[PDB]
């Protein structure tokens, strides 16, 4: 005679699940009913402090006021250039916040997917190690730099033919540090106005001033950097002054603190030789079109998830190919598996690699000017 124990325990557990999943959502909605008594607070900024409790302020949508804090708001921490909160009705200061974002920063900052580490890439081991010495070190420890006593360097630029995985290398960086990446495509900065470009640059740079270990990556900088000639196009005046926004605020009065800039271009020639002086960017390091061992190693990276057999003629694929990126190897391996899927090879024959080398090497009829060598 013990079934009533289970016949009450199961009902107690199920009614407890009901009461928990219902009454807890009911307590959250009770907190929402309490939030129905919560007031929207005015955004604004201190203009200047006059007395111990009078504070000259200005609404960002309009008027100007002299008001006071609550009781414990740490008035000393209000310094002109801080973003504060005001009451709606009595208009008294309720809070100060860390500064704004203007969410164009958000929609390219936290859009970033983390990647695999540098195990995906290869044939740039010199670039891996040396660019590691110019990127990774002073946030691991900045004090071997201070054991010798020298200020750490600032930044670099990647160049060569387009698409070799300059940005994929930055992705391998974006998988390594995993800390504070701001990666901007760096051409949409001109909206339709004049100083809004500069203002967004300032907003990102004060975000980099607030947060310590920041990383900056800009791509296709030819649109935004450009070259200074005598003034022709009025739509290049803006690019010259935006470039001077870069010329100051990559050095500034205050030098940056752990704010690394990483750069990657398709042509570094058209950049102004005011930007080619070191200190700002330390060295322009080259990523090349691969060699035999480079093609072989990145190919064997791409030869991984393949239902192959004892047929893989590595040397014919690498030697019958005459300059092909990691993504060109994606093209060749992908379409070799496609030629397998052409007439449905559930396995992978090697002879389709020859067909893919045929197709892509014949497709290279279309691409000239294979270099832009800086300085």
């Amino acid at each position: 005679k013990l079934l009533e124990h289970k016949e009450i325990d199961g009902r107690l557990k199920e009614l407890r699940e009901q009461l928990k999943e219902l009454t807890k959502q009911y307590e959250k909605s009770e907190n929402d009913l309490k939030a129905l008594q919560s007031v929207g607070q005015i955004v604004g900024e201190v203009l200047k402090q006059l007395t111990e409790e009078k504070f000259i302020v200005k609404a960002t949508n309009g008027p100007r006021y002299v008001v006071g804090c609550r009781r414990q708001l740490d008035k000393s921490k209000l310094k002109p250039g801080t973003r504060v909160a005001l009451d709606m009705t009595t208009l008294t200061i309720m809070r100060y916040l860390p500064r704004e974002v203007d969410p164009l920063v958000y929609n390219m900052s936290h859009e970033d997917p983390g990647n695999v580490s540098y195990s995906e890439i290869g044939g740039l081991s010199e670039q891996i190690r040396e660019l590691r010495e110019v990127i990774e070190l002073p946030l691991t420890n900045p004090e071997l730099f201070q054991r010798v006593g020298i200020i750490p360097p600032k930044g670099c630029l990647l160049y060569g033919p387009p698409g070799t995985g300059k940005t994929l290398l930055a992705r391998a960086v974006a998988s390594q540090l995993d800390c504070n990446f701001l990666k901007v495509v760096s051409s949409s900065i001109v909206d339709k106005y004049i100083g809004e470009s500069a203002r967004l640059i300032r907003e990102m740079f004060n975000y980099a001033r607030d947060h310590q270990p920041c990383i900056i990556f800009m791509d296709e900088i030819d649109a935004i950097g450009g070259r200074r000639f005598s003034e022709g196009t009025s739509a290049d005046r803006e690019i010259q002054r935006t470039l001077m926004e870069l010329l100051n605020q990559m050095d500034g009065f205050d030098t940056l603190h752990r704010v690394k800039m990483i750069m990657a271009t398709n042509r570094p020639d058209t950049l102004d030789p005011a930007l080619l002086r070191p200190g700002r960017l330390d060295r322009k390091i080259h990523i090349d079109l691969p060699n035999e061992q480079a093609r072989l190693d990145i190919l064997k990276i791409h030869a991984g998830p393949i239902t192959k057999h004892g047929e893989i003629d590595y040397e014919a694929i690498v030697k019958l190919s005459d300059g092909f990126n990691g993504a060109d190897l994606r093209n060749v391996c992908t379409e070799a598996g496609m030629f397998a899927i052409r007439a449905d090879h559930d396995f992978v024959v090697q002879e389709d690699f020859m067909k893919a080398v045929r197709k892509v090497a014949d497709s290279k009829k279309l691409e000239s000017k294979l270099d832009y060598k800086p300085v």
Partner: protein, 54 residues
């Protein structure tokens, strides 16, 4: 500007312009420029004047 004794005209940061009775508290010459002055929320009258700003 001031029309007469202790009653004057102030524009505002609310958008429009107003003509206000001002107290004898502020000294009668402290209002030469368009100086930073203090008004009332509800009933719009001068309390104090601050000479610097900006």
């Amino acid at each position: 500007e001031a029309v007469d004794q202790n009653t004057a005209i102030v524009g505002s940061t609310t958008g429009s312009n107003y003509y206000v009775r001002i107290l004898s508290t502020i000294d009668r010459e402290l209002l030469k420029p368009n100086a930073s002055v203090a008004l009332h929320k509800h009933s719009n009258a001068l309390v104090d004047v601050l000479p610097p700003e900006a």
